[PDB]
Design a protein around this nucleic acid. Structure first.
Ligand code: GNP
Ligand code: PHE
Ligand code: MG
Ligand code: MG
Length: 405
RNA sequence: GCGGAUUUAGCUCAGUUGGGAGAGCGCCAGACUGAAGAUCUGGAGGUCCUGUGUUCGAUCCACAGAAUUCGCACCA
């Protein structure tokens, strides 16, 4: 609504993950401040600006994910700050599902904790290809060995879910202090402040280590719904990160999945951080106004694609790995009939597992392969990765292996 | 997104503290009546919405789903 969006740098999606309270949000606001200083039109955001709905303000925790914008000389970023409370992993999964890189925050005072693990694995099952780590709360600790240790562990954990933990950038700092500092004074620039300067380190890491992706602007348009709004005067808006291809007002699209029949609409609006875009392309975290669809007809988990470009599914073979009790998983085998939840991108749907012949019960830590029959149809594709969570926990990580129906 | 309710027989609802359900209508047999409705004797009918945890055992508890509802949040 307030301005037009003008491409002048490359665009990259990022965000925050880590164990509950390790400082994801503080650091988020601290990034806004600092960037704002050397780049004018970066609107800054305070904590309250981010954790703003009341329970969030009350309980003092992040519950909904938040989108914030910010840039550096090199690039322009959409940053998703996620909740670290285990009760809220679906939100987090949804945000991580839009990152091109994820900033994994680990409180140096606490070391790696559970969602530290979880988030890392979930990020992965959701497509996150790079992680930069920010060891926060440093101000609170000085034994270097304890710092140095937390690093190892973090790296090693990364290795486990196979992120090049050996090469992953690991920035140490206090986000609280940076923020605080920008509070005293907004205009601090690099070199002026210690604490602030670590954020420049983060900012650099992000600029440097997370490559800007290749974008298949040519393939058919595909954008996974992350959220939905009802906007004043205009209508029904669907927000998400463009998978591939593109859109501009006037194009008609398809709302696919999570429902009997798929449905058509013409996109009547395209924004990016509340700013008009002529045409959004693969990588844009956009918002789309859709001709006459109610909030009921559009929802997170469905997908926007080139009409006819896509098939929603239900059954499929899949190669899976069940997590150890130890890795935060189940501690009892399961059999056919088990119906946990499947997470593919911003989608999460319940499915009945069917063990192939020769397999009766799958145990924690195995690598099985089986069939699933989803309770709702959804945009699948072989090689598509996913997460299996059930009863409050992540129980497996697999990948589509063949589409049954 | 969050959070509460609710889901039990063909229908509508009661139970419950884990040993596993019960009534009104609705059906049926026998009685009565030409028959029907009322009455009277019996009789049949439920994966207790679903998965998992716990447990010797889960309708019930815990944790997770669905569907319906109702609050609240978010706001390209
Ligand atoms: N000493 C110190 N305390 C800090 C630092 N950052 C945060 N704290 C405090 O740590 C708490 C957690 O802050 P927060 O940023 O909400 O964390 P989060 O990681 O978003 N948590 P959630 O998991 O709920 O979303 C807040 O009190 C924050 O101010 C830091 O760098 N140093
Ligand atoms: C609209 O702002 C999007 N392009 C950015 C966004 C903001 C809020 C929620 C989701 C996406
Ligand atoms: Mg927070
Ligand atoms: Mg229950």
């Amino acid at each position: 609504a307030k301005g037009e969006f003008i491409r002048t740098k490359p665009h990259v999606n990022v965000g925050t993950i880590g164990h509950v309270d390790h400082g994801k949000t503080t650091l988020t606001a601290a990034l806004t401040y600092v960037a704002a200083a050397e780049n004018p039109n970066v609107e800054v955001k305070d904590y309250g600006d981010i954790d703003k709905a009341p329970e969030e303000r009350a309980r003092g925790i992040t519950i909904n994910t938040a989108h914030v914008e910010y840039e550096t000389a090199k690039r322009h970023y959409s940053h998703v700050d996620c909740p670290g409370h285990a009760d809220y992993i679906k939100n987090m999964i949804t945000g991580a599902a839009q990152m091109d890189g994820a900033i994994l925050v680990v409180s140096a005072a606490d070391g790696p904790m559970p969602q530290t693990r979880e988030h890392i694995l979930l990020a992965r099952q959701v497509g996150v290809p790079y992680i930069v780590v920010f060891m926060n709360k440093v101000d609170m600790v000085d034994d270097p060995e304890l710092l140095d240790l937390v690093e190892m562990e973090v790296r090693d954990l990364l290795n486990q879910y196979e992120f090049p933990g050996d090469e992953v950038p690991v920035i140490r700092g206090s986000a609280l202090l940076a923020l605080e500092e920008m509070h005293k004074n907004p205009k601090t620039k690099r070199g002026e402040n210690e604490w602030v300067d670590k954020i420049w380190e983060l900012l650099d890491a992000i600029d440097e280590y997370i490559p800007t992706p290749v974008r298949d602007v040519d393939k058919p348009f595909l954008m996974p719904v992350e959220d939905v709004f009802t906007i004043t005067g205009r209508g029904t808006v669907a927000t998400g990160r463009i998978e591939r291809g593109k859109v501009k007002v006037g194009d008609e699209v398809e709302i696919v999945g999570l429902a009997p029949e798929t449905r058509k609409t013409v996109v009547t609006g395209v924004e990016m951080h509340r700013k008009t875009l002529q045409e959004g392309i693969a990588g844009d975290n956009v918002g789309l106004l859709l001709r006459g669809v109610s909030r009921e007809e559009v929802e997170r988990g469905q997908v926007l694609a080139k009409p006819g470009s896509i098939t929603p599914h239900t059954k499929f073979e899949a190669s899976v790995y069940i997590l150890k009790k130890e890795e935060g998983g189940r501690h009892t085998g399961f059999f056919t009939g088990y119906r946990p939840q499947f997470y593919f991108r911003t989608t999460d749907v319940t499915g009945v597992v069917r063990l192939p012949q020769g397999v009766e019960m799958v145990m924690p830590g195995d690598n099985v392969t089986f069939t699933v029959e989803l309770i709702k149809p959804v945009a699948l594709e072989e090689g598509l990765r996913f997460a299996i969570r059930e009863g409050g926990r992540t129980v497996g990580a697999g990948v589509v292996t063949k589409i049954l129906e």
